[PDB]
Amino acid sequence: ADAHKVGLIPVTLMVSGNIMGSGVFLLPANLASTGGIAIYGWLVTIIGALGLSMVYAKMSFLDPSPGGSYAYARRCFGPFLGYQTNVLYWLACWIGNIAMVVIGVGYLSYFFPILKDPLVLTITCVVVLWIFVLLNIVGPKMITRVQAVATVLALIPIVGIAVFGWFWFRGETYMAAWNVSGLGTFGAIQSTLNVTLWSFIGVESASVAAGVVKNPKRNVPIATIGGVLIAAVCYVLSTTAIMGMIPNAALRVSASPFGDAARMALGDTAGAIVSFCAAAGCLGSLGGWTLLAGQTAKAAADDGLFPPIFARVNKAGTPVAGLIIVGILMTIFQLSSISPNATKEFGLVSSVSVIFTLVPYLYTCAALLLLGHGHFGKARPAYLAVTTIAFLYCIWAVVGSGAKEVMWSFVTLMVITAMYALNYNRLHKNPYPLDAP
Amino acid sequence: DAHKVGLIPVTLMVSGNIMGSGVFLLPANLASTGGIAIYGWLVTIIGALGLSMVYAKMSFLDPSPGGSYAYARRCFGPFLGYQTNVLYWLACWIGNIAMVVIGVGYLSYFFPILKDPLVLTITCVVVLWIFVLLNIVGPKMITRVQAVATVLALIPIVGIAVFGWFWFRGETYMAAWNVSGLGTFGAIQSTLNVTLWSFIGVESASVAAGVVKNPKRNVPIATIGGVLIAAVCYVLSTTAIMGMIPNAALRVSASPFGDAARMALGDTAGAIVSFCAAAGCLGSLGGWTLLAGQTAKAAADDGLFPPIFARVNKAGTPVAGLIIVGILMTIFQLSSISPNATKEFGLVSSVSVIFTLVPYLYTCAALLLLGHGHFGKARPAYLAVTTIAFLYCIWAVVGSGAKEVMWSFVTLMVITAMYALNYNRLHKNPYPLDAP
Ligand SMILES: N=C(N)NCCCCN
Numbered sequence: 001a002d003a004h005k006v007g008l009i010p011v012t013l014m015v016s017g018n019i020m021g022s023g024v025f026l027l028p029a030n031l032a033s034t035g036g037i038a039i040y041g042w043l044v045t046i047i048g049a050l051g052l053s054m055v056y057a058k059m060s061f062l063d064p065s066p067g068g069s070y071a072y073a074r075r076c077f078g079p080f081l082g083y084q085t086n087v088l089y090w091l092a093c094w095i096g097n098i099a100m101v102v103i104g105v106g107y108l109s110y111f112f113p114i115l116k117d118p119l120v121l122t123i124t125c126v127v128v129l130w131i132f133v134l135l136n137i138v139g140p141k142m143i144t145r146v147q148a149v150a151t152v153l154a155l156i157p158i159v160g161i162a163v164f165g166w167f168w169f170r171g172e173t174y175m176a177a178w179n180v181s182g183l184g185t186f187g188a189i190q191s192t193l194n195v196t197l198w199s200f201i202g203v204e205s206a207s208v209a210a211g212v213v214k215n216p217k218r219n220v221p222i223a224t225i226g227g228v229l230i231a232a233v234c235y236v237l238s239t240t241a242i243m244g245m246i247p248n249a250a251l252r253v254s255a256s257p258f259g260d261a262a263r264m265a266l267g268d269t270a271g272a273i274v275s276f277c278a279a280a281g282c283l284g285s286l287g288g289w290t291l292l293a294g295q296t297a298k299a300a301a302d303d304g305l306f307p308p309i310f311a312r313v314n315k316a317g318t319p320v321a322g323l324i325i326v327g328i329l330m331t332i333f334q335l336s337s338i339s340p341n342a343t344k345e346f347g348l349v350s351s352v353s354v355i356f357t358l359v360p361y362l363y364t365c366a367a368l369l370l371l372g373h374g375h376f377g378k379a380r381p382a383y384l385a386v387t388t389i390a391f392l393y394c395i396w397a398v399v400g401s402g403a404k405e406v407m408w409s410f411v412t413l414m415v416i417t418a419m420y421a422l423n424y425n426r427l428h429k430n431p432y433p434l435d436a437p
Numbered sequence: 438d439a440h441k442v443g444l445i446p447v448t449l450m451v452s453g454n455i456m457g458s459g460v461f462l463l464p465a466n467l468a469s470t471g472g473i474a475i476y477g478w479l480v481t482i483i484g485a486l487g488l489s490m491v492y493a494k495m496s497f498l499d500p501s502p503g504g505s506y507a508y509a510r511r512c513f514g515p516f517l518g519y520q521t522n523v524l525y526w527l528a529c530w531i532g533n534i535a536m537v538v539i540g541v542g543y544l545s546y547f548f549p550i551l552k553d554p555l556v557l558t559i560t561c562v563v564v565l566w567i568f569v570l571l572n573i574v575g576p577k578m579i580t581r582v583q584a585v586a587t588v589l590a591l592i593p594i595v596g597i598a599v600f601g602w603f604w605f606r607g608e609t610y611m612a613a614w615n616v617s618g619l620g621t622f623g624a625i626q627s628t629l630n631v632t633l634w635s636f637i638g639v640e641s642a643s644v645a646a647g648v649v650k651n652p653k654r655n656v657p658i659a660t661i662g663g664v665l666i667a668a669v670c671y672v673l674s675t676t677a678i679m680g681m682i683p684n685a686a687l688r689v690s691a692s693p694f695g696d697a698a699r700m701a702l703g704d705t706a707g708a709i710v711s712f713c714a715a716a717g718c719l720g721s722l723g724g725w726t727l728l729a730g731q732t733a734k735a736a737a738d739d740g741l742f743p744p745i746f747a748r749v750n751k752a753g754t755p756v757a758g759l760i761i762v763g764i765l766m767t768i769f770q771l772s773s774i775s776p777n778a779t780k781e782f783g784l785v786s787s788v789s790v791i792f793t794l795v796p797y798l799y800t801c802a803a804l805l806l807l808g809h810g811h812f813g814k815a816r817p818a819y820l821a822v823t824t825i826a827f828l829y830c831i832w833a834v835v836g837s838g839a840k841e842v843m844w845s846f847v848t849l850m851v852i853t854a855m856y857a858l859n860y861n862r863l864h865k866n867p868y869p870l871d872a873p
Pocket residue numbers: 018019020021022023092093094095096097098100198199200201202289
C-alpha cells in the first residue's frame with residue numbers, strides 16, 4: 001500500500017503547481033488594466049487564501065479521508081451533499097483541463113506556429129490530454145514526479161524576476177500606472193479581486209488527493225499551506241516586479257508578458273525559454289487535476305455515491321477506468337478549439353465549472369466547524385475567525401463573478417438535486433423517515 | 438378541531454395566495470407576447486398541477502407543520518431544513534411589500550392621493566400591520582377574512598369568463614397571435630417567464646398544515662383544488678380579455694380589467710373591478726403572513742431558527758414571530774416613498790421570488806426519497822409526475838434574470854456559512870470524527 005504513496009515534496013509541488021500552472025504568466029497582463037493598486041487586491045486575496053488553506057490543512061489533519069471536500073461534506077451533511085460536492089468538483093476538475101491544455105499548447109506556438117492553426121491545436125491538445133491520462137494510469141508517483149519537474153521548470157522565470165527583476169524594477173514605472181481603472185479605490189481593488197481571487201483554485205489539491213499521500217495527517221496540511229504560500233509569494237513578487245519593469249500600456253497589450261518582455265530583453269532564446277517553462281508549468285498541471293478528478297470520483301464511488309466503475313482499480317489502486325472516462329469526456333469537450341466561434345461557445349461552460357469549486361470550499365469551511373469543534377480547545381475564537389475569513393473568500397469570489405455563470409451554477413445545483421432524488425430513492429437513508437408503509 | 442381551519446377557507450387560501458395580485462395583470466404582461474401565450478399556459482398548468490400533486494401526496498404521507506421545511510428536514514437533515522425555512526420565510530414576508538403596494542394601488546381608483554408615494558408608504562405600513570394583527574387574532578379569523586376577500590376577487594374574473602365570451606372575437610385574438618417578434622419557442626418562453634411564476638402559492642395548505650383541520654385529508658384536497666381554480670381562472674380571464682380588447686390597448690394598459698371595465702360598463706364597473714382586485718390583493722397578505730409565521734414556528738420548534746419564533750399564546754399562535762415579521766416588513770416597506778426608492782428594492786423582491794423554488798425542489802425530492810415505499814404498483818406514475826414538477830422548478834429559474842439568480846446563489850452560500858457559525862457543536866454529524 002505504502003509503495004504507491006507520494007512524498008511531501010511532490011505533493012507540495014502538485015498543490016503549488018495546480019494553483020499557479022495555468023495563469024501565473026498571464027496575471028500581470030490582466031491586472032495591468034487596474035494598475036499597481038492591485039497590490040491591495042493581492043493583500044486581501046492572500047489573507048483569504050491562507051484562511052482557506054488553513055481550513056483545509058486543519059480539516060485534513062483531523063480527517064485525512066480520500067476525496068477531500070467530498071469526504072468532509074458527506075461527514076457533516078450526509079450522502080446527498082457528498083454526492084453533490086463530488087459531482088461539482090469532479091466536473092470542475094476535468095472540464096477546466098480543456099482551458100489549460102489550450103493555453104499550454106498555446107505557449108508552444110512560440111516554437112511551432114502551426115499550433116496556432118485551430119485544427120492542429122485541437123489534435124495536439126487531445127494528444128496531450130491523453131498523455132497525461134496515461135501517466136495517471138501509470139500511477140500517482142509517476143504523475144507527481146512529472147508535475148514536480150514541470151512545476152520547478154515553471155518557477156525559473158517567476159523567481160528569476162522575483163529575485164533579480166528587482167534590480168531593473170522602478171517605482172516610478174509602477175506608480176505611473178497606480179490606478180488606470182478609472183474607478184475609485186474600492187472599485188479598483190474589487191476589479192483586482194475579480195482576477196486574483198480565482199488565482200488560488202487548487203488549494204484543496206492535497207486534501208482531495210489525501211488517499212495517495214504518505215503520512216497524510218502530517219503531509220497534507222504542510223503541502224496545503226506550503227503550496228499556497230509559494231503561489232502567493234510568486235504571484236505578488238512576479239506581478240509587482242513586472243509592473244515596475246514594463247510600461248503599463250505595453251503590459252496591457254501583451255498576450256504573454258513575461259514572454260513578450262523576455263523575448264525582447266535578453267534575446268530570442270530568453271523568450272523561447274520562458275515560453276517553454278510556461279508550457280511546462282501549464283501542461284504539468286493537467287496531470288494533477290486529472291489525478292484529483294480520478295480521486296474524488298473514486299472516493300465517492302466507494303461510498304456508493306457515484307457510479308461503481310469509478311471505483312474499479314488495478315492492483316496498485318489506481319482508478320484506471322475512471323481516468324479513462326475522464327479522458328474521453330475531456331476529448332469530447334476539447335473539440336471546442338477547432339474554430340474561433342467554437343471556442344466562444346464553450347467558454348461559459350469553462351467559467352461555470354470554475355464556480356463549481358467554491359461549493360466544496362464552502363462545505364469544507366462548514367465541515368471544519370461542524371465536525372471539529374471538539375478539537376479546537378480554547379483556541380476556538382481563532383478557528384472561528386480563520387474559518388469566517390475562508391467563508392468570506394468563497395462568497396466574495398462569487399459576488400464578483402458574472403451573473404450568467406453563477407446563474408448556471410445555480411441551475412446545476414438543482415439539476416444535481418433532481419438527479420440524486422431520481423437515482424437514489426429507496427437506496428437513500430432518511431434522517432427522519434416516515435413509519436412503515 | 439376548535440382553533441383549526443376547515444376545507445373551504447384553506448382551499449380559498451391556496452387559490453387566493455396564488456391568484457393574489459397577478460391574475461389581473463397577466464393579460465398585460467402576456468400582451469407583449471400575444472395570443473400564443475395559450476401554449477405557455479398549457480405548459481405552465483401541466484407543470485403546476487404536477488407540483489401540486491407532489492405537494493398533495495407528500496402532505497398526505499406526512500401532514501407536518503411547515504410544509505416543505507418539514508419534508509426537507511426529513512429527507513436531508515437539519516442543514517437543508519434550516520436553509521428551506523430561511524429561504525421560504527424570507528420569500529413569504531419580502532413578497533408582501535409588492536403585494537400591498539399593488540393592492541393599495543387598485544384602491545387609488547377611489548382615492549388618487551394614494552399615488553403620492555409618501556401617503557402610499559404610510560398606507561401600506563398600516564395595512565401590513567392590520568393583517569399582522571388579524572393573524573395575531575387567529576388563523577380562523579385570517580382565513581375567514583381571506584376567504585371573503587378571495588370570493589370577492591373572483592367576481593370580475595368569473596364574470597368575464599362567463600359573460601365576456603359574448604364579446605369575444607377570435608379575429609381579435611388571432612390578430613395578435615404572435616406580436617413578440619420571435620419564433621414559436623421564444624414566444625412560448627417569454628410567455629413562460631410570466632406564467633410559471635403565476636402558481637407560486639401551491640405550497641400554501643402544506644405549510645399551513647398545522648392549523649388545518651384533518652390536514653391529512655384536507656391539505657391535499659385544498660392543495661389540488663386551489664391550483665385547479667387558479668389555472669382555470671388564469672386561462673379563461675387572460676384568453677377572454679385577449680379576444681375582447683385589441684392587443685395594442687392591452688399592452689399599454691397597466692390595469693387592463695379596470696380600464697376595460699371602466700370604459701365598458703361605466704365609472705361604476707371600474708370601481709367594482711378595482712374594489713375586487715384590491716380585495717384579492719390585500720386578502721392574501723394575511724395568508725402569506727400566516728405561512729411566514731408557520732414555517733418559522735415549525736423550524737424554531739426543532740431548534741433550527743431563533744426560539745422566539747416558536748413562542749406562542751394559549752391558542753398556539755406565533756404572536757412574537759408575527760410582530761417581528763411586521764417590523765421587518767415595515768422597515769422594508771419604506772422603499773415606496775419615491776419612484777427612486779421603489780426600483781432599488783426590485784432585485785430583493787425578484788430574488789425573494791426565486792427563493793420559493795428551493796423548497797419546491799426539496800419537496801419533489803422528498804416525495805421520492807421518503808414515500809417510495811408507498812407507491813407500489815403506481816411507481817412509474819409518481820416518478821413521472823414528480824419529474825414534471827422538477828422540470829417546472831428548473832425551467833422557471835432558467836428563464837429568470839441572471840442577476841436575480843446569482844444573488845439567490847449568494848444567499849445559499851451565506852445561509853451555509855451562518856448555519857456553520859451558529860449551529861456548530863449543537864449540530865450532529867452523520868459521520869462524526871472520533872473523540873479528541
Ligand atoms: N479545473 C481545472 N482542471 N484546473 C483549475 C486550475 C486553476 C488554477 N488556479
